[PDB]
């Protein structure tokens, strides 16, 4: 086409979606990880995760307001990944990298799994 | 912080949100413009437009499944702007620039209004 493009548009959209999440505006699901609860937007979860994409395209699960993750999933690993989904920023540290990689493999977040594998190989 | 960042993350999120829109997955509102109907995600509309942001943060309007725009709004101008919201790409042409600018002013999309003003000043 003959379109023009606004370079910062996608980043600005994601920043506003994170602002809505922080104020709990139009969040439509709670993700339960052990005792911890995380409110989010189903569309953002689907856009970032192969697992959530499969869950919310399912004719029955698409209507659930609560999703319980596998008990092996670490709440901190999930929190770091949920923050990444809404910001593009990953808080990857020596103390959390194993929990982050395991959670990203479960959530099917291919790019996160790739950077975790590379950071582990380097050490 | 000590975060790492995935450059293409915001663009990839927006691409997936557009894929959901095209398949009509988890759309929660219909925007009525004259006779024309446009299905969308409230969160994406809010993230892109000062007008939708005001509408869906309103305790009563946040629950509406149908929003009717002012009858002066041109459906083609709206369609071009809705496509921009989900792609960062604006189909700005000599034949639509006046309708696009008027719709962007009404929707409160400051960056679109700015490029329309500059393109008009050049001609």
């Amino acid at each position: 086409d003959s379109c023009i493009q606004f370079t910062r548009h996608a980043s600005d959209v994601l920043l506003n979606l994170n602002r809505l999440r922080s104020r709990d505006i139009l969040t439509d699901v709670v993700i339960v990880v052990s005792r911890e609860q995380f409110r989010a937007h189903k569309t953002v979860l689907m856009a970032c995760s192969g697992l959530f994409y499969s869950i919310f395209t399912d004719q029955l699960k698409c209507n659930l307001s609560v999703i319980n993750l596998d008990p092996e999933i670490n709440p901190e690993g999930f929190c770091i990944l949920l923050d990444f989904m809404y910001t593009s920023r990953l808080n990857l540290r020596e103390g959390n990298i194993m929990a982050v990689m395991a959670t990203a493999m479960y959530l099917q977040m291919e790019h996160v799994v790739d950077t975790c594998r590379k950071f582990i190989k380097a050490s | 912080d000590s975060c790492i960042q995935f450059t293409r993350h915001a663009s990839d999120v927006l691409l997936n949100l557009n894929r959901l829109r095209s398949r009509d997955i988890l759309t929660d509102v219909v925007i009525v413009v004259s006779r024309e109907q446009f299905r969308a995600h409230k969160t994406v509309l809010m993230a892109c437009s000062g007008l939708f942001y005001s509408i869906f943060t309103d305790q009563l309007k946040c629950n509406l499944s149908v929003i009717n725009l002012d009858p002066e709004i041109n459906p083609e101008g709206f369609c071009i702007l809705l496509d921009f919201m989900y792609t960062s790409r604006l189909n700005l042409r000599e034949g639509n620039i006046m309708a696009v600018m008027a719709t962007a002013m009404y929707l409160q999309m400051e960056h679109v209004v700015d490029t329309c003003r500059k393109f008009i000043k050049a001609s």
Partner: peptide, 4 residues
Amino acid sequence: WVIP
């Protein structure tokens, strides 16, 4: 704004 750019030419994509």
